[PDB]
């Protein structure tokens, strides 16, 4: 899945 990649890439803006 890329959409826990998109829970991920919210997740890596701090």
Do not use: F, R, S, V
């Not at 899945?1 to 701090?14: E, F």
């Amino acid at each position: 899945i890329n959409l826990k990649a998109l829970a991920a890439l919210a997740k890596k803006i701090l």
